[PDB]
Design a protein around this ligand. Structure first.
Ligand code: OGA
Ligand code: FE2
Ligand code: ZN
Lengths: 347, 5
């Protein structure tokens, strides 16, 4: 407890309301929320100054093409499930919005979130919804320079700068069109990077998050529930097919917090922060990964999936060399035994 | 290298 641990001790999901002045410098504001211990929860919400907008209106996107929509079939019981993504032929936002609003895939009625949440976990294996996910592109207007997911200017840019390598969705923007019951399984970002998520419009998106500080406990639980998957790939959670309900988490003592993201709101996940969730109804979100100096250690130690050969792999070399010159030689000879303090901020 | 999706 050296002042680092005395900040956000409960490691709960914090919400920030930055002035246009603070909102202007992305990397600075991130370092700030971390100074407030936001990273402990693994997830943070950031409501942008009310007069800020990245687009005039979205009446034009009804034409946009979702080249690879996916149908989410879920199999499981008792709070433990495996999600299988079936790919469907391309479609336009209108065709998607049509099915999303249809009485068949429409959001059910309810009073309090607590009830909408109970219905999610009761019916996620029924009526396989369609998710227009991982669509390359952005909805930000070319002139927006504040928190533009298309050009955040973090050190993650070094990947491209140094090698020309493009990793769709990681160092490029991704759009997600969801409907009721579409969901994202438990996972940390590729290479355990940070992620930014802006909900452009539509119904809310709810999130579940486990503090990085307890990430390994979630992995051990997951391994035990799916021993078959764990042995064919240690990092099987990166397959993004595992769903675990909050009740199961509660039952096994795994700390977590929940939050619901509204339209016009930003969500930030931190290195090694496990998260999962679902969409309330029709909506549109844009996202990408980013990095900070603090990420470097996480990147060096990220446990990657090796069973699939198309998984995101980033050479850490350029980062250690440039930001950890004193350790480059040691790390290269695999003798860098740096232990990571999840509560610590980049001092 | 790699890709999301
Ligand atoms: O949109 C989704 O289903 C999931 N989005 C994320 O996990 C993210 O932006 O970090
Ligand atoms: Fe994520
Ligand atoms: Zn794997």
């Amino acid at each position: 407890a050296s002042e680092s641990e005395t900040l956000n001790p409960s490691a709960r999901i914090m919400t920030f309301y930055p002035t246009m002045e603070e909102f202007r410098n992305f990397s600075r504001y991130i370092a700030y929320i971390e100074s407030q211990g936001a990273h402990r929860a693994g997830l943070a919400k950031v409501v942008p100054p009310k007069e800020w907008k990245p687009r005039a209106s979205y009446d034009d996107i009804d034409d946009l093409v979702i080249p690879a929509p996916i149908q989410q079939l879920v199999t499981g019981q008792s709070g433990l499930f495996t999600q299988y993504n079936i790919q469907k032929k391309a479609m336009t936002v209108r065709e998607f919005r049509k099915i999303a609003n249809s009485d068949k895939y429409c959001t059910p009625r309810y009073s309090e979130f607590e009830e909408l949440e109970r219905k999610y976990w009761k019916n996620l294996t029924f009526n396989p919804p369609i998710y227009g996910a991982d669509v390359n592109g952005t909805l930000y207007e070319k002139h927006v320079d504040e928190w533009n997911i298309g050009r955040l200017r973090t050190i993650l840019d070094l990947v491209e700068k140094e090698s020309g390598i493009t990793i769709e969705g990681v160092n490029t923007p991704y759009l997600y069109f969801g409907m009721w019951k579409t969901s994202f399984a438990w996972h940390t970002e590729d290479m355990d990077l940070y992620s930014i998520n802006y909900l452009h419009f539509g119904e809310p998106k709810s999130w579940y998050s486990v503090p990085p500080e307890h990430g390994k406990r979630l992995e051990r639980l997951a391994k035990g529930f799916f021993p078959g998957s764990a042995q064919s790939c240690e990092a099987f959670l990166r397959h993004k097919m595992t769903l675990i309900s909050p009740l199961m988490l509660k039952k096994y003592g795994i700390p977590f917090d929940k939050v619901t993201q509204e339209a016009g709101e930003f969500m930030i996940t931190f290195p090694y922060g496990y998260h999962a969730g679902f969409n309330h109804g029709f909506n549109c979100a844009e996202s990408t990964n980013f990095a900070t100096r603090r990420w470097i250690e996480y990147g060096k130690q990220a446990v990657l999936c090796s069973c699939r050969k198309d998984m995101v792999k980033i050479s850490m070399d350029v980062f250690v060399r440039k930001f950890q010159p004193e350790r480059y030689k040691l790390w290269k000879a695999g003798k860098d035994n740096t232990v990571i303090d999840h509560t610590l901020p980049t001092p | 290298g790699g890709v999301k999706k």
